[PDB]
Homo-oligomer: A and B are copies of this chain.
Amino acid sequence: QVQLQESGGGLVQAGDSLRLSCVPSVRTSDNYIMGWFRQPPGKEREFVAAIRRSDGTTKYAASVKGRFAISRDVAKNAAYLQMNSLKAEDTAVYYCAAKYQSTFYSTMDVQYDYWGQGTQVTVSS
């Protein structure tokens, strides 16, 4: 059905910033929730930040609350995760996701539908 195209990964060192992007392949008229999951080396996947398509309702993790910022482009049908002031612990594999089926805030970080192959972000010190 829907495939996700990720962009903007790479390598930085501590203190810099990165910008991740993700655009879905089809532009159906749904209320999907673009989110970001990260999987640290030798650990399991976990939620980072999500955003709703209709409004700019953003969820966040306790780890990254003041640093990270997520936004959406209504025109280009995109979503961007602006990572700021990276820590050496932010090294992981970052995945996007879709979650088309239900769009309520209380469940905005539990069950996504389409993932799309992850990007690699490896910050140094």
Which listed residue (B62, B106, B113) contacts A1, Cβ 8 A? B106
**Closest B residue, CB atoms, query A98:** B106
- Indicate how many identical chains form the complex: 2
Interface size of A by CB at 8 A reads: 8
Question: Which label, helix, strand, loop or mixed, suits the secondary structure of the A interface?
Answer: loop
Set of chain B residues within 8 Å of A113, measured between Cβ atoms: 106
Q: How far is the CB of A24 from chain B (nearest CB, A)?
A: 13
Q: How far is the CB of A113 from chain B (nearest CB, A)?
A: 4
A104 to B2, CA, bound (A): 11
A55 to B114, CA, bound (A): 19
**Chain A residues within 8 Å of B, Cβ to Cβ:** 1, 62, 104-106, 113-114, 117
